[PDB]
Amino acid sequence: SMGFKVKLEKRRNAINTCLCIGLDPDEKDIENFMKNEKENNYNNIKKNLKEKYINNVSIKKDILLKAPDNIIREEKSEEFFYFFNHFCFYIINETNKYALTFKMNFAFYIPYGSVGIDVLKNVFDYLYELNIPTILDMKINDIGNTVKNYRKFIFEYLKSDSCTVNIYMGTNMLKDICYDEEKNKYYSAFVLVKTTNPDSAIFQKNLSLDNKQAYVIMAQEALNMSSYLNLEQNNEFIGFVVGANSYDEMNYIRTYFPNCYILSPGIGAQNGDLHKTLTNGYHKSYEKILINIGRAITKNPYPQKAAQMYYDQINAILKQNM
Amino acid sequence: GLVPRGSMGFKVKLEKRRNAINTCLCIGLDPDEKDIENFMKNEKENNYNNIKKNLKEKYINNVSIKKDILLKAPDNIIREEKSEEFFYFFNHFCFYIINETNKYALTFKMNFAFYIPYGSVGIDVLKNVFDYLYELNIPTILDMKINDIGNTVKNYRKFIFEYLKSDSCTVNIYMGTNMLKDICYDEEKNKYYSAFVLVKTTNPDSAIFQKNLSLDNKQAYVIMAQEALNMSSYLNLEQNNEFIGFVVGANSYDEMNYIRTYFPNCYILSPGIGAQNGDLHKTLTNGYHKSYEKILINIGRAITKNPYPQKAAQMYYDQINAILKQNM
Ligand SMILES: Nc1c(F)c(=O)[nH]c(=O)n1[C@@H]1O[C@H](COP(=O)(O)O)[C@@H](O)[C@H]1O
Numbered sequence: 001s002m003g004f005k006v007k008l009e010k011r012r013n014a015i016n017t018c019l020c021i022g023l024d025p026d027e028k029d030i031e032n033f034m035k036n037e038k039e040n041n042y043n044n045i046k047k048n049l050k051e052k053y054i055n056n057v058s059i060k061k062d063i064l065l066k067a068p069d070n071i072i073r074e075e076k077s078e079e080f081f082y083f084f085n086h087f088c089f090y091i092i093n094e095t096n097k098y099a100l101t102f103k104m105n106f107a108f109y110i111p112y113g114s115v116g117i118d119v120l121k122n123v124f125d126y127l128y129e130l131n132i133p134t135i136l137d138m139k140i141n142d143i144g145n146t147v148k149n150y151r152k153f154i155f156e157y158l159k160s161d162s163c164t165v166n167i168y169m170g171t172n173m174l175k176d177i178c179y180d181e182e183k184n185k186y187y188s189a190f191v192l193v194k195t196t197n198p199d200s201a202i203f204q205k206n207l208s209l210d211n212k213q214a215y216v217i218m219a220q221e222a223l224n225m226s227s228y229l230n231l232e233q234n235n236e237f238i239g240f241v242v243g244a245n246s247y248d249e250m251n252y253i254r255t256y257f258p259n260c261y262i263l264s265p266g267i268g269a270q271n272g273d274l275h276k277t278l279t280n281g282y283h284k285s286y287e288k289i290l291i292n293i294g295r296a297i298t299k300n301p302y303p304q305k306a307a308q309m310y311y312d313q314i315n316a317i318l319k320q321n322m
Numbered sequence: 323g324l325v326p327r328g329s330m331g332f333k334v335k336l337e338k339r340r341n342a343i344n345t346c347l348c349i350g351l352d353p354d355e356k357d358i359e360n361f362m363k364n365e366k367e368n369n370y371n372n373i374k375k376n377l378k379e380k381y382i383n384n385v386s387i388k389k390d391i392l393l394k395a396p397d398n399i400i401r402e403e404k405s406e407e408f409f410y411f412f413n414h415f416c417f418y419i420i421n422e423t424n425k426y427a428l429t430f431k432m433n434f435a436f437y438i439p440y441g442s443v444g445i446d447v448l449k450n451v452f453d454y455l456y457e458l459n460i461p462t463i464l465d466m467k468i469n470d471i472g473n474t475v476k477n478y479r480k481f482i483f484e485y486l487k488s489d490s491c492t493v494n495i496y497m498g499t500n501m502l503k504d505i506c507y508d509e510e511k512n513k514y515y516s517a518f519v520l521v522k523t524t525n526p527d528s529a530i531f532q533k534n535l536s537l538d539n540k541q542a543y544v545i546m547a548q549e550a551l552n553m554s555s556y557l558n559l560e561q562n563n564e565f566i567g568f569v570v571g572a573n574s575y576d577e578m579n580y581i582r583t584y585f586p587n588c589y590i591l592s593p594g595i596g597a598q599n600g601d602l603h604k605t606l607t608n609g610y611h612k613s614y615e616k617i618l619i620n621i622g623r624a625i626t627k628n629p630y631p632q633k634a635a636q637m638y639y640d641q642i643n644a645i646l647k648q649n650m
């Protein structure tokens with residue numbers, strides 16, 4: 001209805017942050033949650049069961065509402081599903097008051113087969129009920145006919161607000177990701193521009209055209225396609241993934257595309273510098289500089305307090321910049 | 323001298339299959355919603371001829387997910403298992419294509435995008451398709467074009483190579499070539515795996531980055547091919563009977579010629595024949611290698627949307643083989 005641009009602006013006004021909470025639970029995370037709950041009389045699962053919107057998830061809700069001691073003896077084949085989903089609900093419940101957006105990386109939800117995709121659907125359902133803007137980090141790329149399937153999965157099935165896209169194959173893929181001609185629907189995406197892996201320079205900086213590094217060429221082509229699609233008129237956008245640890249490029253991108261939406265992962269687990277990243281990418285509409293924090297919250301044993309201190313530190317830095 | 327099904331590296335598996343059936347046809351299995359619905363319609367209209375044939379195949383008993391449902395009478399599904407109907411007809415469409423066409427296929431390539439848009443149900447189908455192909459011992463590619471940082475991509479490695487037991491996958495290395503360390507190698511288990519990295523793709527605007535970007539008069543696609551091979555060497559893949567090869571579009575005749583000229587012994591996967599209208603003669607000629615498992619020609623919709631996929635697959639197999647014989 002409102003469109004992602006508007007969702008972001010309105011939630012920014014309500015919670016006054018640009019923290020994007022990453023929800024990438026790994027097998028160890030799920031196993032640790034199960035073990036801790038088991039040894040703590042399921043105190044967090046019990047809290048989960050008291051939240052109202054658990055009642056609105058799509059898949060196997062009745063299983064999720066069962067008492068953990070009954071799951072383990074009467075629905076044991078659903079034990080992994082139940083604890084994985086409950087870990088996600090627990091992180092969301094503990095941290096959502098500090099989050100402008102949640103980003104879920106698809107890779108974490110696929111490796112067990114179908115079960116994690118049901119979890120992923122329920123996570124999207126839950127965030128939707130909470131009116132929290134969402135990003136599916138799936139780095140999708142293919143030819144037009146094929147990518148329409150991702151459009152359906154991400155924007156119709158999950159009802160995500162946005163996704164990440166790798167446009168190395170070409171930009172025209174965005175016509176079949178960010179736009180549905182038959183339905184007249186428009187969607188938002190962040191394209192990979194400068195990534196956090198240690199060898200990201202190999203293609204992103206070392207290749208060039210004219211006198212511009214590849215990452216600039218790619219940012220500019222993504223913006224040309226946004227214009228072509230008239231996304232911003234429809235309250236949607238194509239934005240950029242720029243690594244936290246990539247200060248020069250962040251500085252360059254914010255200077256040269258002054259009003260672009262940036263998503264910046266790499267603080268916490270990957271050691272990026274929060275002050276420098278937020279200052280180089282700063283915009284007064286700070287929804288345009290999403291600071292993603294995943295593992296530094298999810299692998300923190302006190303995730304509410306972890307999210308709070310990122311929120312508070314972001315706030316202090318936002319204030320310094322103005 | 324004999325190695326059992328599943329106990330050899332992908333280089334050896336491809337080589338043996340290529341010796342067996344003498345082709346480089348790669349059949350693509352990309353079932354769309356219309357395909358599944360049309361299969362269900364056609365089977366309902368013909369008393370489920372093809373499903374009953376799937377049900378007599380021995381290896382259907384060896385698939386992992388919901389065998390109880392898959393092995394039911396189709397009229398029982400429709401009347402008593404309404405919520406499993408889509409799963410059943412989707413999975414049976416895939417088994418039908420496999421059953422009708424496998425004798426002509428050097429490899430099957432499944433594009434992950436077609437298996438995700440309904441949520442979990444298609445991933446169960448996909449897992450059964452991979453289990454089925456593993457039992458048939460047909461070489462497999464999962465076309466997922468994966469890319470992420472190392473910690474995250476490990477999860478795709480587990481899905482593709484442990485859960486699906488795929489032989490290979492497609493990979494976009496624009497983020498960096500170091501992700502390959504976490505895709506083609508598992509340091510915990512000391513296992514090696516094969517992949518095809520995107521080099522030149524078939525989309526109409528593929529030149530915009532792959533050709534326009536360059537370093538010192540070498541275009542991006544050449545740099546990216548070299549970097550991938552550099553990483554294959556470092557990882558010792560070919561000494562472990564695995565490889566990193568290249569996706570080069572059927573319609574990219576000059577780039578195919580360049581790649582085969584400059585990397586004489588590389589493995590090439592080439593989509594774009596059939597529905598995308600690539601030139602098969604030109605593609606095969608420019609990509610030719612006498613070990614023709616090194617020039618896989620993928621055909622998807624031209625087979626899977628034909629009402630007689632066995633005959634369509636035979637026609638492409640025969641056309642390819644005729645062009646292979648011309649080269650020699
Ligand atoms: N999409 C990403 C990029 F393009 C990138 O350049 N670097 C990234 O880390 N991510 C993702 O951002 C998240 C980083 O999570 P955390 O380190 O735990 O805080 C993971 O989902 C990564 O896969």
Ligand SMILES: Nc1c(F)c(=O)[nH]c(=O)n1[C@@H]1O[C@H](COP(=O)(O)O)[C@@H](O)[C@H]1O
Nearest residue numbers: 146433523524569593597598621622623
């Ligand atoms: N992986 C691909 C590439 F890198 C590429 O450059 N072009 C492609 O078509 N594919 C895939 O190859 C198949 C083409 O299928 P068919 O057209 O029905 O014969 C689909 O899965 C495509 O997504």
